[PDB]
Design an enzyme around this catalytic site. Structure first.
Site, short mmCIF file in Angstrom:
data_model
loop_
_atom_site.label_atom_id
_atom_site.label_comp_id
_atom_site.label_asym_id
_atom_site.label_seq_id
_atom_site.Cartn_x
_atom_site.Cartn_y
_atom_site.Cartn_z
N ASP A 180 22.40 20.57 65.04
CA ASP A 180 23.07 19.30 65.29
C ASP A 180 22.23 18.62 66.38
O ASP A 180 21.79 19.27 67.33
CB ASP A 180 24.48 19.54 65.80
CG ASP A 180 24.52 20.53 66.95
OD1 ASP A 180 24.14 21.70 66.72
OD2 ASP A 180 24.92 20.15 68.07
N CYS A 214 27.10 15.62 57.11
CA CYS A 214 27.03 16.61 58.12
C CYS A 214 28.34 16.73 58.85
O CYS A 214 29.35 16.90 58.28
CB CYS A 214 25.88 16.30 59.07
SG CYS A 214 25.62 14.62 59.46
N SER A 221 22.44 13.46 58.21
CA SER A 221 22.59 12.80 56.91
C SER A 221 21.66 11.59 56.83
O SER A 221 21.06 11.33 55.79
CB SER A 221 24.04 12.36 56.71
OG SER A 221 24.92 13.48 56.61
N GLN A 261 20.20 9.93 64.66
CA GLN A 261 20.94 9.94 65.92
C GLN A 261 19.99 10.00 67.11
O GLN A 261 20.34 9.59 68.22
CB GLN A 261 21.91 11.12 65.96
CG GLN A 261 22.45 11.42 67.35
CD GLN A 261 23.33 10.31 67.89
OE1 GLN A 261 23.88 9.52 67.13
NE2 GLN A 261 23.45 10.25 69.21
O1 LIG Z 1 23.90 15.17 62.85
C1 LIG Z 1 23.49 15.22 64.03
O2 LIG Z 1 22.31 15.36 64.31
C2 LIG Z 1 24.50 15.08 65.16
O3 LIG Z 1 25.76 14.73 64.58
C3 LIG Z 1 26.76 14.27 65.48
C4 LIG Z 1 27.77 15.05 66.10
C5 LIG Z 1 28.03 16.43 65.98
O4 LIG Z 1 27.48 17.11 65.12
O5 LIG Z 1 28.84 16.93 66.78
S1 LIG Z 1 28.74 14.06 67.08
C6 LIG Z 1 27.90 12.61 66.74
C7 LIG Z 1 28.34 11.31 67.35
C8 LIG Z 1 29.75 11.16 67.62
C9 LIG Z 1 30.29 9.97 68.17
C10 LIG Z 1 29.40 8.89 68.47
C11 LIG Z 1 28.00 9.02 68.21
N1 LIG Z 1 27.15 7.91 68.50
C12 LIG Z 1 27.01 6.51 68.36
C13 LIG Z 1 25.62 6.00 68.76
C14 LIG Z 1 25.59 4.46 68.60
C15 LIG Z 1 25.99 4.01 67.17
C16 LIG Z 1 27.33 4.62 66.68
C17 LIG Z 1 27.36 6.15 66.90
C18 LIG Z 1 27.46 10.22 67.65
C19 LIG Z 1 26.83 12.89 65.85
BR1 LIG Z 1 25.59 11.60 65.17
#
Ligand SMILES: O=C(O)COc1c(C(=O)O)sc(-c2cccc(NC3CCCCC3)c2)c1Br
Length: 297
Positions: A180, A214, A221, A261
């Protein structure tokens, strides 16, 4: 031209600024339905919602909401459905979506538990002799078989519409070693996996859009879909130079927020496309090379 840009940005170590520029230019659309009080428990993350214009609507009168987006790449002529890891109360909805959208493949890029937390519900049967029945959506799911590799597992599932007794085979591609907020071990292991999704026929235009998830449905994803789309565009024109990766990512972001991300996930996307370009432009040995280097056995 990607490869030149990649070396430029890596020389000046400015992937952070480049990635940040993408966030700054990304589209912003309303997610009013996702924010409705009644849908609070249908979202895994408060800050990750599907835009109303591209959200997948469940075919039911009660509540059609699911946290999923249709990424329709017009020029590439390929669509994907990106969604969150199903929650304990949305697994029925998840499979209802798969059925109604006529998807043949489900790509899962996360593990159920990551860093001590539950990133995704156990939405598929782990043992043949224990099928799953989703009463709310009236669907039955049975594990038919599974091919376990060192870093990914491919499962064959049978989804049944209990209301009509119609059955369909769903292929589940579970990538099990993609951290992640991280990147795959190498372009090879990633490409080996992508090419296995591709070779299954799951991405064919004769089927509904492949479902990709994911945990939040945007990071890993997003990386997976960006790489696939760029390789397809390149393929359609047989011209790697015609692909503007950042532009493609911005296009995708018109359908779902937050796609990719981290700056390194973006950087990894370049690596994967550049390497994949070899196959597209007609190198017949790289596919076997990737398989070897991935150590799937
Ligand atoms: O797949 C991965 O590599 C990580 O996956 C993830 C998460 C996990 O696996 O726990 S949490 C997450 C996340 C949760 C809330 C807000 C934002 N962020 C914001 C950043 C600005 C635009 C809107 C989303 C990101 C992401 Br993506």
């Amino acid at each position: 031209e990607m490869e030149k840009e990649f070396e430029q940005i890596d020389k000046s170590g400015s992937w952070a600024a480049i990635y940040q520029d993408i966030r700054h230019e990304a589209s912003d659309f309303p997610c009013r339905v996702a924010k409705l009080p009644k849908n609070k428990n249908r979202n895994r993350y408060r800050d990750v919602s599907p835009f109303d214009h591209s959200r997948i609507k469940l075919h039911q009168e009660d509540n059609d909401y699911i946290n999923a987006s249709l990424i329709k790449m017009e020029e590439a002529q390929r669509s994907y459905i990106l969604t969150q890891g199903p929650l304990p109360n949305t697994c029925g909805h998840f499979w209802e979506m798969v059925w109604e959208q006529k998807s043949r493949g489900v790509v899962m890029l996360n593990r159920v538990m990551e860093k001590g937390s539950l990133k995704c519900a156990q939405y598929w049967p782990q043992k043949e002799e224990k099928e799953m029945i989703f009463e709310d959506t009236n669907l039955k799911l049975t594990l038919i078989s599974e091919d376990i590799k060192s870093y990914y597992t491919v499962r064959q599932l049978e989804l049944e519409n209990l209301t009509t007794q119609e059955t369909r085979e769903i292929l589940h591609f579970h990538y099990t070693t993609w951290p992640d907020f991280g990147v795959p071990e190498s372009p090879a292991s990633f490409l080996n996996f992508l090419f296995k999704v591709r070779e299954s026929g799951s991405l064919s235009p004769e089927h509904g859009p492949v479902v990709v998830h994911c945990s939040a449905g945007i990071g890993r994803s997003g990386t997976f879909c960006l790489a696939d789309t760029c390789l397809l565009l390149m393929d359609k024109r047989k011209d790697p130079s015609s692909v503007d990766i950042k532009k493609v990512l911005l296009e995708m972001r018109k359908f779902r927020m937050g796609l990719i991300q981290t700056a390194d996930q973006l950087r990894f996307s370049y690596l994967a496309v550049i390497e994949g370009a070899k196959f597209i432009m007609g190198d017949s040995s790289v596919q076997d090379q990737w398989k070897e280097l991935s150590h799937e056995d």
